């Protein structure tokens, strides 16, 4: 039967123009006041999935 | 494209695409193979170790007897056990793209014209529904193994054919690539050729 | 598509057994053993084609030594003399000559001695 998607992965990843995946950075969720503003700013924008974990993401998201 | 007729010795114009294209062997082969696969029926089944009739109790205790460790009497490695990968009934029908099928037909038709196995005539009717008459007509036409393709459906012709196993009479709608390749010669009526051209385009 | 495998299996076994004819006991009667034996024989044969070359050279050298000493010269000296004299006769031939033609061998030895000194 149809392959099922890993719904968590679906929530966390979105495919881009060539077939990458952007994702939201970790560590910008709670205790923030100790984190430096520069660090927070850098974490804020989205980020492409690296070469190492691309395969795993692909496995997770067969219909992405 | 132009096919001269046997009976009137008059030409008949046809499409170069339909009757004068190249023979794409790979495509034709795929279509014929597909036809064969479709024709098969595929009804069989073995019994898995699940389905083999017997109890599901352990033939002997795991340890102690010194025998090798057995779990079910229905094991595939046991005599009268299940077939390991027992078959089920399956559908062997391959899909063939419409265009691919049409192209294959076109190639086969072209090959026939080149090889002089397509014989076009104005009309191939028999007067009575008599095998003897059909046989005589075929002899007169020199023919023995032949696919007679007709435009309009003929009762006398079909009945006459029925008992000649080398002979087969079809309607132009019901032609098939394996049949065309198989039969030594193919005798199309003028209406039939025209109809085929219309069908194939 | 139930491919019964009697005929092929027996033919295969028979070929191996035939190859293992002349072996003691189950090594010529019982397939498992015969096959093991056949493989072993193959391995030995490969080894021994090499060893055959080695052995025959050894034999030739022994014979030549005996002959040369009979004509009053050691093998090593004789070979050196021949090399010096530019005689390219290989020692299979030298051994044969020694065995079957004492005059020829003696002549060769004389040549070697002269070349040596």
């Amino acid at each position: 039967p149809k392959i099922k998607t890993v719904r968590g992965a679906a929530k966390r990843f979105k495919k881009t123009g060539k077939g990458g995946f952007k994702h939201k950075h970790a560590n910008l969720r709670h205790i923030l006041t100790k984190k430096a503003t520069k660090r927070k700013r850098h974490l804020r924008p989205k980020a492409m999935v690296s070469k190492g974990d691309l395969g795993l993401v692909i496995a997770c998201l067969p219909y992405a | 494209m132009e096919l001269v007729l046997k009976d009137a010795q008059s030409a008949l114009t046809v499409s170069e695409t339909t009757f004068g294209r190249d023979f794409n062997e790979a495509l034709v082969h795929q279509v014929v193979v597909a036809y064969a696969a479709g024709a098969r029926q595929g009804t069989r089944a073995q019994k898995t170790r699940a389905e083999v009739t017997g109890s599901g109790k352990k033939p002997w205790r795991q340890k102690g007897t010194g025998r090798a460790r057995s779990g079910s009497i229905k094991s595939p490695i046991w005599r009268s056990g299940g077939v390991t990968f027992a078959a089920r009934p399956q559908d062997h029908s391959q899909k063939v793209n419409k265009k691919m099928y049409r192209g294959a037909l076109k190639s086969i038709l072209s090959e026939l014209v080149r090889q002089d196995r397509l014989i076009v005539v104005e009309k191939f009717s028999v007067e009575a529904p008599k095998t003897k008459l059909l046989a005589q007509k075929l002899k007169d036409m020199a023919l023995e193994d032949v696919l007679i393709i007709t435009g309009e459906l003929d009762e006398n012709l079909f009945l006459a054919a029925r008992n000649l196993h080398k002979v087969d009479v079809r309607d132009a709608t019901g032609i098939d690539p394996v049949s065309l390749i198989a039969f030594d010669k193919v005798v199309m009526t003028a209406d039939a050729v025209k109809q085929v051209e219309e069908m194939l385009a | 598509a139930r491919v019964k495998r009697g005929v092929i299996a027996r033919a295969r076994h028979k070929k191996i057994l035939k190859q293992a004819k002349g072996y003691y006991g189950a090594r010529s009667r019982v397939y498992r053993v015969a096959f093991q034996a056949v493989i072993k024989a193959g391995q030995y044969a490969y080894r021994d084609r090499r060893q055959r070359k080695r052995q025959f050279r050894q034999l030739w050298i022994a014979r030549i030594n005996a002959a040369a000493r009979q004509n009053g010269i050691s093998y090593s000296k004789f070979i050196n003399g021949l090399k010096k004299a530019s005689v390219e006769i290989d020692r299979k031939i030298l051994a044969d000559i020694a065995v079957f033609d004492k005059v020829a061998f003696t002549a060769l030895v004389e040549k070697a001695k002269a070349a040596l000194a």
């Binding site: 890993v6 968590g8 992965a9 929530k11 966390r12 990843f13 979105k14 994702h23 939201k24 950075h25 970790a26 910008l28 969720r29 999935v49 974990d53 795993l56 993401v57 496995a59 997770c60 | 023979f23 062997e25 790979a26 034709v28 082969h29 795929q30 014929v32 086969i108 090959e111 026939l112 090889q115 394996v178 390749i181 198989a182 | -």
Partner: protein, 144 residues
């Protein structure tokens, strides 16, 4: 051309791996699974995104965003699709009849993609700046 003269193209059919048929085969005793592990086992292996236990990437990283229901009912049209309709008026209904946009599509946009040669009247559709310019150049008309 007989039923015993046809043959496939070279490279069309390839040999099907058969595991565990002796030494010469290549795929011998073990069948290309190496030596006894979990992956070696029949049924063996670990589910998608499993990292030995490490929090897997699809969990490490935070969830984000939401799904728009209006996006499911929006659509994007091309100038080649402005030519693919019939007539000289591009409504939703006309586009749908043409089979360009989906049936449950309340909104559509004409984007500068491809090119429009014939004059077309885009009615009740959003049109991008490039597309609008292109249509006007073609000799078209846009109206709300």
């Amino acid at each position: 051309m007989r039923l015993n003269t046809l043959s496939p193209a070279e490279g069309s059919k390839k040999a099907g791996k058969r595991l565990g048929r002796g030494i010469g085969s290549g795929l011998g005793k073990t069948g290309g699974r190496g030596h006894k592990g979990q992956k070696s086992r029949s049924g063996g292996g670990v589910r998608r995104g499993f990292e030995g236990g490490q929090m897997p990437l699809y969990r490490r990283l935070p969830k984000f965003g939401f799904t728009s229901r209006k996006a499911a009912i929006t659509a994007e049209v091309r100038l080649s699709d402005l030519a693919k309709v019939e007539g000289g008026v591009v409504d939703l209904n006309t586009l749908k009849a043409a089979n360009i946009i989906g049936i449950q599509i309340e909104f559509a946009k004409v984007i500068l993609a491809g090119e429009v040669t014939t004059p077309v009247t885009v009615r009740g559709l959003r049109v991008t700046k490039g597309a609008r310019a292109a249509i006007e150049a073609a000799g078209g008309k846009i109206e709300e």
